[PDB]
């Protein structure tokens, strides 16, 4: 029920011989599982937690300079040297300065000059790296019980990814994950600013053009390449001065366009990424699936509701006797000829007589009728579904295509049952995605559309090669238009 | 002499008094009192609403966030008319004096 | 759509495309009129006074 | 152009082309900034709120 | 039952408390302490000085 109302709702149907289905969970999204004779469950990734962060390096973004020094030499005497020149807290640069009799030197020509200033950093941003084994994944397991702590929270660790949830009345659900393949934190770093944090690629973080310290440095004098944060001026080639650049925190913010914001205020809270997990439902049961009918009447307390996924949610109240008892629910036609819909909330049950119960159903396109109870006093509703089968199919195919685009090879594991076709598709798309990543790494989206246009034109103007090229081009165009950055 | 300030661009800004109001789908956009004044930056986006959000229908509902804009550090762009220019030139002959 | 004493049943989209000042229905302040320029005219007869 | 303690002699037109919040120099309130969106950002991590 | 107000369109308006001020050419745009409030309507046009 917790997944009711979220536009990122997904459905998986059927089970294999071992009652195992591969599923994939993303932050902010959740999936709904059901089978022929299994309870309907909701799976949601809510929290990603990293316990042990390690500081990789500290990037300074505001600096101040004091103790400015200057030493000059007459021309043809080399360049001057100062004892702060070795002192690498002091950034130094050598330029050339006009010298002459008016400058107190007996010769005329290009005279040496050097200036040094103490480099002191006011505040900086931290880049934290976490080993993959220090990740914590939180999963809520709420069944479609119809109740108005409803679900069960379980934790996934890379070292112990084997777990099960004890559902009250449903038995036990076994859910084993594999976080080693979800996100490779071995190449990721948790950049942390004054109060905001981003999850960025480690390699892109290392080569940032800022002064930096080793992650273990504490005193603050081991800054590398301070020249990227300070500048030297020779307006008239007569005297050089060094001034500090401005705060780079705004520039850094502009530099994190494609970065994903995370939380590091009260712990390493991550609300990003996916999780491909293996679901086993051998030992699931239905609450009171043996009770008889509710021969009494019913009344709707909250009327028909339409979600973004074509399903209906109904809360109804029972006033007859025999509780607990089964709820007669079925999607019939007007003359009562053929079954038209199916129940998302399989086996609606009245736990307590005065307790309202929420029911879910998926009516077909067109006129749909909800049957509640039995004569006398049977309820019949008159909701109409807006859409068409072709529209549903095409929306499904865009959803699948975008999911493939955004999950890579793991998208085949969203509803894989271990079939050979699924494995072949996964391998082919895996090698294709490896080629694509090795090809279009670190490139803007508009450039992706440009490339797609180029290969589409080439394929159009050049037959197996032509069709392969146009397919690659249209795929690249779809990837470019669908990618956020 | 006498430059005229033309335009001041901000650098340091702080946001306070953030407010969001809970707009259901198909009932129009939300509205706040603070958007009456232009010190508050506001933007309309589209968010999910439902029974869990205490609304009678499921769908994509409106929302607006408004927070007062307060600038701390700004630059100044000044324009001086050409008539106010001042040029100083030094004149020294070859007198030979040290 | 309701007038002072008359009413009409109109399509939602055409109503949303009306070029008149508007508040959202949930608004109660009664002052934030959007696109007010559709009901005002700024006259600048000879480039001396607006 | 004037900074806190530095200054630059730069083109006027490029200066007006700076995509930052601004007021005309004649203002005295110093609070009616223009295109403030260029310096703020609204985020919708899961389309639940901004 | 329970109709919901989707949108309120203004249809009668009046303009009062009109104010204006000019600025000499090439010093930007004229300013009031007043445009900060959105209940007023403002437009920038171009005049001779």
């Amino acid at each position, epitope marked *: 029920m*917790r997944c009711i109302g979220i536009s990122n709702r997904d459905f998986v149907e059927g089970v294999s011989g071992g009652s195992w289905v591969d599923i994939v969970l993303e932050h902010g999204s959740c999936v709904t599982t059901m089978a022929k004779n299994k309870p309907t469950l909701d799976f*949601e990734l*809510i*929290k990603t937690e990293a316990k042990q962060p390690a500081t990789l390096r500290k990037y300074c973004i505001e600096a101040k300079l004091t103790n400015t020094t200057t030493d000059s030499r007459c021309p043809t005497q080399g360049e001057p040297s100062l004892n702060e020149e070795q002192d690498k807290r002091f950034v130094c640069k050598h330029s050339m300065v006009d010298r002459g009799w008016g400058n107190g030197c007996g010769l005329f020509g290009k005279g040496g000059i050097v200036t040094c200033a103490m480099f002191t950093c006011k505040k900086n941003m931290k880049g934290k790296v976490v080993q993959p084994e220090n990740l914590e994944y939180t999963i*809520v397991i709420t069944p479609h019980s119809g109740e*108005e702590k409803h679900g069960k929270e379980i934790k996934i660790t890379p070292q112990s990814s084997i777990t099960e949830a004890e559902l009250t009345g449903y038995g036990t659900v076994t859910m084993e994950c594999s976080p080693r393949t979800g996100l490779d934190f071995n190449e990721m770093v948790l950049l942390q600013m004054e109060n905001k944090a981003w999850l960025v690629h480690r390699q892109w973080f290392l080569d940032l053009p800022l002064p930096w310290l080793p992650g273990a440095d504490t005193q603050g004098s081991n800054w590398i390449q301070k020249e990227t944060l300070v500048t030297f001026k020779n307006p008239h080639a007569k005297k050089q001065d060094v001034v500090v650049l401005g705060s780079q925190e705004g520039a850094m913010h502009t530099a994190l366009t494609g970065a994903t914001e995370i939380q590091m*205020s*009260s712990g390493n*809270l991550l*609300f990003t990424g996916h999780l491909k997990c293996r679901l086993r439902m051998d030992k699931l049961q239905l609450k009171g699936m043996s009770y008889s009918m509710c021969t009494g009447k019913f009344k709707v*307390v*909250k009327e028909i509701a339409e979600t973004q996924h074509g399903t209906i949610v109904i*809360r109804v109240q029972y006033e007859g006797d025999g509780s607990p008892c089964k709820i007669p629910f079925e999607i019939m036609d007007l003359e009562k000829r053929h079954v038209l819909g199916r129940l998302i909330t399989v086996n609606p049950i009245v736990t307590e007589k*005065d307790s*309202p119960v929420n029911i879910e159903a998926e009516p077909p396109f067109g006129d749909s009728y909800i049957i509640i109870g039995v004569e006398p006093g049977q309820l019949k509703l008159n909701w109409f579904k807006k859409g068409s089968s072709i529209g549903q199919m095409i929306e499904t195919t865009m959803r699948g295509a975008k999911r493939m685009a955004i999950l890579g090879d793991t998208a085949w594991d969203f509803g894989s049952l271990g079939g050979v076709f699924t494995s072949i598709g996964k391998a082919l798309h895996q090698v294709f995605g490896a080629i694509y990543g090795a090809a279009f790494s670190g490139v803007s989206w508009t450039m992706k559309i440009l490339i797609g246009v180029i290969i589409t034109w080439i394929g159009m103007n050049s037959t197996s090669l032509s069709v392969s090229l146009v397919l690659v081009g249209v795929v690249t165009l779809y990837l470019g238009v669908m990618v956020q950055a | 002499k006498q430059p005229a300030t033309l335009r001041k661009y901000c650098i340091e800004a702080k946001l306070t008094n953030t*407010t*969001t*109001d*809970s*707009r*259901c789908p198909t*009932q129009g956009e*939300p509205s*706040l009192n603070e958007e009456q004044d232009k010190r508050f930056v506001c933007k309309h986006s589209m968010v999910d609403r439902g*029974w*869990g*959000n*205490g*609304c*009678g229908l499921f769908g994509k509902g409106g929302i607006v966030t408004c927070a007062m804009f307060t600038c701390k550090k700004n630059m100044k762009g000044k324009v001086v008319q050409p008539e106010n220019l001042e040029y100083t030139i030094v004149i020294t002959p070859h007198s030979g004096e040290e | 759509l309701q007038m002072e004493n008359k009413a009409w049943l109109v399509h939602r989209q055409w109503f949303l495309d009306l070029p008149l000042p508007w508040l959202p*229905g*949930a608004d*109660t302040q009664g002052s934030n009129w959007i696109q007010k320029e559709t009901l005002v005219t700024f006259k600048n007869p000879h480039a001396k006074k607006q | 152009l004037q900074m806190e303690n530095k200054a630059w002699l730069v083109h006027r037109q490029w200066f007006l082309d700076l995509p930052l919040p601004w007021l005309p120099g004649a203002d005295t309130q110093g609070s009616n900034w223009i295109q403030k969106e260029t310096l703020v950002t609204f985020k919708n991590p899961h389309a*639940k*709120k901004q | *039952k*329970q109709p*919901a*107000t989707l949108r309120k369109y203004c249809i009668e308006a009046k303009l009062t408390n009109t104010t204006t001020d000019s600025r000499c050419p090439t010093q930007g745009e004229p300013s009031l302490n007043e445009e900060q409030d959105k209940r007023f309507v403002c437009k920038h046009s171009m005049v001779d000085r």
Partner: antibody
Framework: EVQLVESGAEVKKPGASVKVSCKASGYTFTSYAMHWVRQAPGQRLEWMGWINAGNGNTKYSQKFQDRVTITRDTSASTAYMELSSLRSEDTAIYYC?????????????????????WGQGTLVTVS | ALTQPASVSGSPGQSITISCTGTSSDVGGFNYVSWFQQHPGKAPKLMLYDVTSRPSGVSSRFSGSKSGNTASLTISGLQAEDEADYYCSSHTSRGTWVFGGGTKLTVLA
């Protein structure tokens, strides 16, 4: 069992400062928001504001913006509501209430069963 | 604020309806309609939240329904212990909470 414990009755001169303690036990304090509601004797209830124990952020009513500040203590599983510059009309009964935050540790949309439990109340008299 | 009758009285064992009226931002737009019972000298206790549904441990005598901008509370079979202060609360659109003026329930002897 969720038990809400409040301090005893207090009397203070007008213009003073009073901090009340509401201690909640029997549950995970960090995963629930905390509310403060006042009520003049024989009058209607008034809502001041709430504090989210997950992050410690603050939100108060429009009337009580510049005078009411509420803080939380994770270690003691209690929230402290401090009101300064008391007035003769501030004499009322003060109740502390609890409700559930979402699974993301935020209190943007309150749950349907908000104000699920209530405290016994603190009586403050202003001279 | 929220407008509701100051006092409502009814014979025991009867059915009575009390209504709480607000505005479109809090009552007529949201389902955050809840009712609380205030015993004299005792802490308030919720008798009804999400008027379409009822809480746990509360008798089914109390029933709530919303008609437009007005939310109504109906009690079937009035009894002696029902004499208490009842408050209607709504979570407004602006993110704050508004309460009714308080209602005193009287049962005839």
């Amino acid at each position: 069992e969720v038990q809400l414990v409040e301090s005893g009755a207090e009397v203070k001169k007008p213009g003073a400062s009073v901090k009340v303690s509401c201690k909640a036990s029997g549950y995970t304090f960090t995963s629930y928001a905390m509310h403060w509601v006042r009520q003049a004797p024989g009058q209607r209830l008034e809502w001041m504001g709430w504090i989210n124990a997950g992050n410690g952020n603050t939100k108060y009513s429009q009337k009580f913006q510049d005078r009411v500040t509420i803080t939380r203590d994770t270690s003691a599983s209690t929230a402290y509501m401090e009101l300064s510059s008391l007035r003769s009309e501030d004499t009322a009964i003060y109740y502390c209430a609890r409700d559930k935050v979402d699974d993301y540790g935020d209190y943007w949309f309150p749950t349907l069963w908000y104000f699920d439990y209530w405290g016994q109340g603190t009586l403050v008299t202003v001279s | 604020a929220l407008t509701q009758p100051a006092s409502v009285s009814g014979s025991p064992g009867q059915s009575i309806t009390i209504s709480c009226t607000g505005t479109s931002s809090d009552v007529g737009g949201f389902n955050y309609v809840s009712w609380f019972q205030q015993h004299p000298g005792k802490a308030p206790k919720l008798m009804l939240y999400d008027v379409t549904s009822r809480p746990s441990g509360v008798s089914s005598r109390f029933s709530g329904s919303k008609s437009g901008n007005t939310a109504s509370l109906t009690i079937s079979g009035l009894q002696a212990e029902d004499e208490a202060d009842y408050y209607c609360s709504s979570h407004t659109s602006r993110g704050t909470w508004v309460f009714g003026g308080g209602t005193k329930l009287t049962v005839l002897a």
